[PDB]
Amino acid sequence: VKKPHRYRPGTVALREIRRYQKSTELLIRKLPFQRLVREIAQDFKTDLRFQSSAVMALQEACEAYLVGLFEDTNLCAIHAKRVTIMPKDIQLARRIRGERA
Amino acid sequence: VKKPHRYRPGTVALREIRRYQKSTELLIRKLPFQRLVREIAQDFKTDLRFQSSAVMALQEACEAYLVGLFEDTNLCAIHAKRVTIMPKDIQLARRIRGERA
Amino acid sequence: RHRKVLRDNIQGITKPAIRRLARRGGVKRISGLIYEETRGVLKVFLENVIRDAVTYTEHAKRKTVTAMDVVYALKRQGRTLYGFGG
Amino acid sequence: VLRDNIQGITKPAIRRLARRGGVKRISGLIYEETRGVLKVFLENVIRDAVTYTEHAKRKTVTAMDVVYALKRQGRTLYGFGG
Amino acid sequence: ELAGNAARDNKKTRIIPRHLQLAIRNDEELNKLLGRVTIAQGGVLPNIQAVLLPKKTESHHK
Amino acid sequence: ELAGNAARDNKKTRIIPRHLQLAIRNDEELNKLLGRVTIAQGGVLPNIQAVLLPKKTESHHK
Amino acid sequence: RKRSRKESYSIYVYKVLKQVHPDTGISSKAMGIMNSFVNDIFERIAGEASRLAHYNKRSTITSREIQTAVRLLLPGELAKHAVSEGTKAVTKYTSAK
Amino acid sequence: RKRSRKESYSIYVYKVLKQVHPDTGISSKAMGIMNSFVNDIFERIAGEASRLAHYNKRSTITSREIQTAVRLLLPGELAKHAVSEGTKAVTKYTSAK
DNA sequence: ATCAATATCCACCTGCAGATTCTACCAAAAGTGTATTTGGAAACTGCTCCATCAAAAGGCATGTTCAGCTGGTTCAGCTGAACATGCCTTTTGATGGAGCAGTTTCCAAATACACTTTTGGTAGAATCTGCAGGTGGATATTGAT
DNA sequence: ATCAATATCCACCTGCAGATTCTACCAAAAGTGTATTTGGAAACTGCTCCATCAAAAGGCATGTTCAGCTGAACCAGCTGAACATGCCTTTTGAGAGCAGTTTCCAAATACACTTTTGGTAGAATCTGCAGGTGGATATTGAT
């Protein structure tokens, strides 16, 4: 070949969309998440221990929350006639759903 | 003055804003709202009667809900670099709040 | 005569009232199309609420809808209301 | 080296999450914001969980504590008991 | 306490609902606790977004 | 029942959670009942917003 | 030999699944999901029934309270079919004591 | 002359108001609002405390459970101040019977 | 249109972790009978809902005028998806041994329940004043010029 | 910018519609006493969890590269705000239904004891499915 084969922008991203939409495995790595949780809980109470299933539960809850947010965010972005998401989109969605924080 | 006095566009609305935000009186007239309530109740059960305070309470709830909706609407509008609200904004707001339609 | 006041129905909820409500929401400039959609939205909300109220009414074997039923119906939809009892 | 440990949640994992949301294009500034956002959610959950844990005068955190703390934020969870 | 302060702002000696709404919405924590509550006859805050207000460069222009 | 229909549709004889999520979200009424529930290992529905997809003007145009 | 006892709704789910689709199995995780689901609906309905009974100063829960709660919580046609099933169940049970 | 008796929390609120801002009154409607507010908070706390009791197989609801519920519902410094008031109050109660 | 490159679906097909079957028990469901508690069908009382017709006050359906917003176009940057490459944080997979989840004993600390005795919280009838409303006039604000 | 128009802010006055305060009582709070529970001290076990190692391997960090995207300028046009008005819709005031109590009881339903008894823990087998193996398509982009 004279040049390397190289997909155009969007195609491979869309391929990844369909792949991850077809499967269900968790996307966050186990160990870093474990260490994060342990550090925060340590900040609240010391020398705690964690069942594996509680960590898994937090994992599932976080990923579900994130995907829900990004979905509504994407709608907000499309509303402004763009395709690239930006922080103010997230802030808008989070302000409307009442998770103001 | 030969010319009748005339305010520039975008001032009497502001005057309305300050007047209605300083006060708390209900904006909608009672009778058509009352007739609407009775008409809608008829389609579920017949020969119902309504206490006045129940209708007043419903009116308050409706106005607060719509007021909040217009706030969220205007934010959705401002995100699109407009000042005029339109239906697709409303549809977006209701999609984000998690309601049905 | 066909008067049927603007429909003998919701269309008596005139434009300037909606305008006033939009003014309370901070709005400055409104399109003509808002009005109809708003009415539809309002209708939907009312329907659900009234249904619940009437259901409470049906449980106690009454034909007069009370304030308390409405308050509870508003509570279940996450729109708690103060100032009309409980 | 560790970077306050939130950085274990790498960029491409966030990118995969966004992909599952149906998003095509992501700005480089999202990631940092997302991290902060995530932290808040977790913090709230864990607080509630630990509080339940503290009431039983236990030192081991159980899944059920998390499930209840999620239930109270209106994000009810199925599939981990109770 | 908050309601009484808002009452003194309007030179009224008797607390009315408007004052309670102002008290709740201006304190962050209560607003979180009562985020999904409607105060009857409460109204809302005068908050208008800066963008929809006229141009502050409306001055000496010849 | 709905899950088993989806199972036969994917040529699998044993039920797993993905089937349940597919069954719930594809029915309007159950979606309303379970709009704020997370099924573990459930994933999401396939859905791409129409406007983000490339144009169908991808063929001989010369 | 000291050992525990954990209750669940596994067997009943299994019966129903064999009744509607005799030649088909289900994993344990999905069974867990169904268990959580059942428990959640049980909690919701009982809570609503309680609130109704308290507002009318009646100290007893009957099928009527459950029915009202169902019509409030569940939407439309689903509520109708469920009400019909429950009504048939009660009428057969009271007939065949 | 059937003469009813509808209870409320009005008078206590009025006392507190005269304690904190002596030269000030309050209408009836606002008092009704505050009454509904108190009722709401009471219901939330009691429900939460109940669930806490059931999860740990305890049949007594104690001050500890109330404390836990308050730490859950309320944010930060408000929780701390409320807890401090409660602890002071229970400490005074336990001694000076 | 055509044809090379990469990614994706589909026939054969095998050993096993998870699924199902099968024993053997005993912690939950029914029966019998009883003691205790209720929701709902008759009387009765006092708010307050049904929604007409004159007379009058003030809000809207219509039409008219024009400034300033929408939303289309063109385009100069710019920035973020694809990708190769290395290498290096994690994956499986074992092994230990400390200690919390959880169990059991049992009785000292905390509460229902049943009675009696104060008592203050709540209708209802007499007094108050802050604010609605009115009256009037100085200053702030829009805008023509 | 300066001056006219004109709404808004703000002083001063009166009375009455809601606020506040007095009074005679009955549902409710509280003190005894007992019985009846119940949750924390004490004592133990055994499953599951926290700190280590070793051989890969698959994912992250970093560094190039270019197609395609996000504002900024500008503007034809449309479309929705500001006022005259008249005109017409909305406010106000002159007996029986039904919510709210009360009797009081035929019916409903908790609770003590036994007798079963299907449900569950746990050992002992099945087999569909996570992998693999390989071939045939189906998108995609270059040209």
Swiss-Prot record, chains A, B:
Modified residues (N6,N6-dimethyllysine): K2, K45
Protein transport keyword on record: no
Residue numbers bearing the N6-methyllysine modification: K2, K3, K22, K30, K45, K88
Residues that bear N6-glutaryllysine: K22, K45, K81, K88
N6,N6,N6-trimethyllysine modification, residue list: K2, K22, K45
GO process terms (BP): chromatin organization; epigenetic regulation of gene expression; gene expression; nucleosome assembly; telomere organization
Top-rank taxon: Eukaryota
Residues bearing PTM N6-(beta-hydroxybutyryl)lysine: K22, K45, K88
N6-(2-hydroxyisobutyryl)lysine: residues carrying this PTM: K2, K22, K30, K45, K88
Tagged with keyword NADP: no
Signal peptide: none
Positions of post-translational N6-acetyllysine modification: K2, K22, K45, K81, K88
One cellular component term from this protein's GO annotations in UniProt: nucleus
N6-lactoyllysine modified-residue sites: K22, K45
Modified residues (Phosphotyrosine): Y7
GO molecular function: cadherin binding; DNA binding; protein heterodimerization activity; structural constituent of chromatin
Phosphothreonine modifications at: T46, T73
Predominant location category: nucleus
PTM per Swiss-Prot/TrEMBL: Acetylation is generally linked to gene activation. Acetylation at Lys-88 (H3K122ac) by EP300/p300 plays a central role in chromatin structure: localizes at the surface of the histone octamer and stimulates transcription, possibly by promoting nucleosome instability.
Cell compartment(s), UniProt: Nucleus; Chromosome
List of residues that carry N6-succinyllysine: K22, K45, K88
Physiological role: Core component of nucleosome. Nucleosomes wrap and compact DNA into chromatin, limiting DNA accessibility to the cellular machineries which require DNA as a template. Histones thereby play a central role in transcription regulation, DNA repair, DNA replication and chromosomal stability. DNA accessibility is regulated via a complex set of post-translational modifications of histones, also called histone code, and nucleosome remodeling.
Family membership noted in the UniProt record: Belongs to the histone H3 family.
Protein name per UniProt: Histone H3.1
Gene for this chain: H3C1
Interval of the full protein contained in this chain: 36 to 136 of 136
Curated annotation (Swiss-Prot), chain C:
Effect of R19W: In TEBIVANED3; results in early developmental defects when expressed in zebrafish embryos
DNA-binding region: 1-4
Result of changing K15R: Abolished ufmylation
Entry-annotated residues carrying N6-methyllysine: K4
Modified residues (N6-(beta-hydroxybutyryl)lysine): K15, K61, K75
In-chain residues carrying the UniProt-annotated modification N6-propionyllysine: K15, K28, K61, K63, K75
UniProt modified residues of type Phosphoserine: S31
Cross-link Glycyl lysine isopeptide (Lys-Gly) (interchain with G-Cter in SUMO2) mapped to chain: K4, K15, K43, K63, K75
Subcellular localization, as worded in the UniProt entry: Nucleus; Chromosome
Record note on modification: Acetylated as part of spermatogenesis progression prior to histone-to-protamine exchange. Demethylation is performed by JMJD6.
Signal peptide start and end residues: none
Protein purpose: Core component of nucleosome. Nucleosomes wrap and compact DNA into chromatin, limiting DNA accessibility to the cellular machineries which require DNA as a template. Histones thereby play a central role in transcription regulation, DNA repair, DNA replication and chromosomal stability. DNA accessibility is regulated via a complex set of post-translational modifications of histones, also called histone code, and nucleosome remodeling.
Record annotation: effect of changing K75E: In TEBIVANED2; results in severe early developmental defects when expressed in zebrafish embryos
Effect of K75Q: In TEBIVANED1; results in severe early developmental defects when expressed in zebrafish embryos; results in defective cell cycle progression when expressed in zebrafish embryos
MF GO annotations: DNA binding; protein heterodimerization activity; RNA binding; structural constituent of chromatin
Upper lineage: Eukaryota, Metazoa, Chordata, Craniata, Vertebrata
Protein name: Histone H4
Curated annotation (Swiss-Prot), chains E, F:
Top-level taxon of the source organism: Eukaryota
PTM comment: Monoubiquitination of Lys-56 (H2AK119Ub) by RING1, TRIM37 and RNF2/RING2 complex gives a specific tag for epigenetic transcriptional repression and participates in X chromosome inactivation of female mammals. It is involved in the initiation of both imprinted and random X inactivation. Ubiquitinated H2A is enriched in inactive X chromosome chromatin. Ubiquitination of H2A functions downstream of methylation of 'Lys-27' of histone H3 (H3K27me). H2AK119Ub by RNF2/RING2 can also be induced by ultraviolet and may be involved in DNA repair. Phosphorylation at Thr-57 (H2AT120ph) by DCAF1 is present in the regulatory region of many tumor suppresor genes and down-regulates their transcription.
Localization terms from the record: Nucleus; Chromosome
Glycyl lysine isopeptide (Lys-Gly) (interchain with G-Cter in ubiquitin) cross-link, renumbered residues: K56
Modified residues (N6-glutaryllysine): K32, K55, K56, K62
Residues recorded as bearing N5-methylglutamine in the entry: Q41
Modified-residue entries (Phosphothreonine), positions: T57
Chain positions found as N6-(beta-hydroxybutyryl)lysine: K32, K55
Modified residues (N6-(2-hydroxyisobutyryl)lysine): K11, K12, K32, K55
Positions bearing N6-succinyllysine: K32
Positions of modified residues (N6-crotonyllysine): K55, K56, K62
Family stated for the protein in its record: Belongs to the histone H2A family.
Subunit structure and binding partners: The nucleosome is a histone octamer containing two molecules each of H2A, H2B, H3 and H4 assembled in one H3-H4 heterotetramer and two H2A-H2B heterodimers. The octamer wraps approximately 147 bp of DNA.
Protein name, per record: Histone H2A type 1-B/E
Annotated source species: Homo sapiens (Human)
Full-protein positions shown: 65 to 126 of 130
UniProtKB/Swiss-Prot annotation, chains G, H:
Modified residues (N6,N6,N6-trimethyllysine): K57
Modified residues (N6-crotonyllysine): K6
Site of covalent link Glycyl lysine isopeptide (Lys-Gly) (interchain with G-Cter in ubiquitin): K6, K92
Keywords from the named record: Acetylation, ADP-ribosylation, Antibiotic, Antimicrobial, Chromosome, DNA-binding, Glycoprotein, Hydroxylation, Isopeptide bond, Methylation, Nucleosome core, Nucleus, Phosphoprotein, Ubl conjugation
Post-translational modification Phosphothreonine, affected residues: T87
Post-translational modification N6,N6-dimethyllysine, affected residues: K29
Post-translational modification (record): Monoubiquitination at Lys-6 (H2BK34Ub) by the MSL1/MSL2 dimer is required for histone H3 'Lys-4' (H3K4me) and 'Lys-79' (H3K79me) methylation and transcription activation at specific gene loci, such as HOXA9 and MEIS1 loci. Similarly, monoubiquitination at Lys-92 (H2BK120Ub) by the RNF20/40 complex gives a specific tag for epigenetic transcriptional activation and is also prerequisite for histone H3 'Lys-4' and 'Lys-79' methylation. It also functions cooperatively with the FACT dimer to stimulate elongation by RNA polymerase II.
Modification N6-lactoyllysine occurs at: K15, K57, K80, K88, K92
Quaternary structure and partners: The nucleosome is a histone octamer containing two molecules each of H2A, H2B, H3 and H4 assembled in one H3-H4 heterotetramer and two H2A-H2B heterodimers. The octamer wraps approximately 147 bp of DNA. Heterodimer H2BC11 and H2AZ1 interacts with VPS72 (via N-terminal domain).
Similarity comment: family membership: Belongs to the histone H2B family.
Protein name per its UniProtKB record: Histone H2B type 1-J
Gene: H2BC11
Residue span relative to the full protein: 30 to 126 of 126
